[PDB]
Amino acid sequence: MASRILLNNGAKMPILGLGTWKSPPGQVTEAVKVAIDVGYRHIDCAHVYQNENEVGVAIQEKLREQVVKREELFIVSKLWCTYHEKGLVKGACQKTLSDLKLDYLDLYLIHWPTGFKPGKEFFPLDESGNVVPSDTNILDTWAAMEELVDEGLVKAIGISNFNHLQVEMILNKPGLKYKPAVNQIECHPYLTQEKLIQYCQSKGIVVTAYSPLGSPDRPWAKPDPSLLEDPRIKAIAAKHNKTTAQVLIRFPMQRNLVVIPKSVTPERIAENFKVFDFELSSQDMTTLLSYNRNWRVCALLSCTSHKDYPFH
Numbered sequence: 001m002a003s004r005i006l007l008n009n010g011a012k013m014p015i016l017g018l019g020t021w022k023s024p025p026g027q028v029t030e031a032v033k034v035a036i037d038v039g040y041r042h043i044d045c046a047h048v049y050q051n052e053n054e055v056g057v058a059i060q061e062k063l064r065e066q067v068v069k070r071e072e073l074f075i076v077s078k079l080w081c082t083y084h085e086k087g088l089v090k091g092a093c094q095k096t097l098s099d100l101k102l103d104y105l106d107l108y109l110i111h112w113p114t115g116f117k118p119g120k121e122f123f124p125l126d127e128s129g130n131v132v133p134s135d136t137n138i139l140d141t142w143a144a145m146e147e148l149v150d151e152g153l154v155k156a157i158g159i160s161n162f163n164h165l166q167v168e169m170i171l172n173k174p175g176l177k178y179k180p181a182v183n184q185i186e187c188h189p190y191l192t193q194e195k196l197i198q199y200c201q202s203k204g205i206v207v208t209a210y211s212p213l214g215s216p217d218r219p220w221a222k223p224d225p226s227l228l229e230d231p232r233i234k235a236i237a238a239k240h241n242k243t244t245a246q247v248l249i250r251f252p253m254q255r256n257l258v259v260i261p262k263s264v265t266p267e268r269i270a271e272n273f274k275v276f277d278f279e280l281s282s283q284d285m286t287t288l289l290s291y292n293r294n295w296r297v298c299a300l301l302s303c304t305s306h307k308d309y310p311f312h
């Protein structure tokens with residue numbers, strides 16, 4: 001299969017990237033180095049993950065080694081919720097740029113639609129545990145994102161964890177200058193996202209699937225359904241002489257999605273890339289879709305009263 005998808009900014013995005021949430025800072029530099037050595041050309045990052053400096057060390061070393069050229073990499077990061085303010089967006093982007101050792105990002109996303117009170121804490125709470133909102137809306141945040149394109153800091157802008165109506169808000173914005181290129185959302189066989197994917201794809205927005213393996217290392221995991229251990233998915237994998245993870249990665253690829261599995265295990269980083277030499281049948285695809293149960297890795301009770309919390 002073709003390795004890149006065309007975005008509505010005219011640039012091409014690798015359909016397979018390396019996730020970095022939870023990648024320990026003492027492991028992620030090697031993980032990214034290995035990933036680039038074995039063919040990855042897309043890294044998914046975020047300031048809130050607290051490891052962009054270490055990701056950046058890897059990127060810079062591989063550029064300095066001339067393993068890759070900068071134009072061949074597709075580096076994605078995300079604006080955290082406490083920086084939804086006109087006067088904070090540029091500096092947030094620039095901190096990410098400085099940490100990643102870059103002069104531009106290929107794609108910069110609004111990480112979640114909700115703005116929170118600015119400050120040192122990533123999740124400012126009231127004394128009863130509710131997140132403290134910002135009054136700044138997704139449209140004003142979007143205008144700030146558009147400025148980053150116009151200043152050369154980012155080549156593309158997009159959104160993440162935006163629901164149907166929030167995507168529509170963005171598309172209907174008065175004076176919209178740049179459409180979102182991407183909506184990055186959770187997507188896997190237990191949360192197949194057909195409705196949101198069809199909406200987004202119908203509008204030309206590319207969808208990136210996060211937590212494609214069901215985020216087994218998520219910190220709130222309970223001893224919960226498990227994609228990697230689902231014998232029905234294992235059976236499809238066995239039939240194709242592939243791993244369950246490889247099936248779980250190939251699945252979104254054949255839906256015209258980008259997918260960003262995370263690993264810090266070198267052998268798995270390599271395994272996860274070996275997904276361009278086999279095809280799931282239409283019956284396999286429909287069978288995997290049939291496993292939907294509307295199960296989310298990423299949700300957060302403290303944020304559920306925010307006006308713009310995306311999920312119900």
Ligand SMILES: NC(=O)C1=CN([C@@H]2O[C@H](COP(=O)(O)OP(=O)(O)OC[C@H]3O[C@@H](n4cnc5c(N)ncnc54)[C@H](OP(=O)(O)O)[C@@H]3O)[C@@H](O)[C@H]2O)C=CC1
Nearest residue numbers: 019020021210211212213214215217245261262263264265
């Ligand atoms: N925009 C957003 O709000 C969000 C974005 N994301 C992005 O998506 C990425 C991927 O999602 P994430 O939630 O991390 O979870 P994933 O679904 O990618 O699962 C990661 C887990 O799977 C394990 N694993 C990886 N490959 C294999 C394999 N071949 N066999 C068995 N186990 C394997 C990893 O172990 P190990 O590392 O030990 O090898 C790790 O424990 C994130 O890292 C982040 O970049 C995720 C959530 C939210």
Ligand SMILES: O=C(O)COc1cc(F)ccc1C(=S)NCc1ccc(Br)cc1F
Nearest residue numbers: 021046048049050112114298299300303309
């Ligand atoms: O968010 C990620 O990329 C991965 O997850 C995280 C990554 C971090 F570095 C810190 C917190 C999270 C959490 S708890 N994320 C879920 C979450 C956050 C905010 C809102 Br609005 C809703 C929600 F569901």
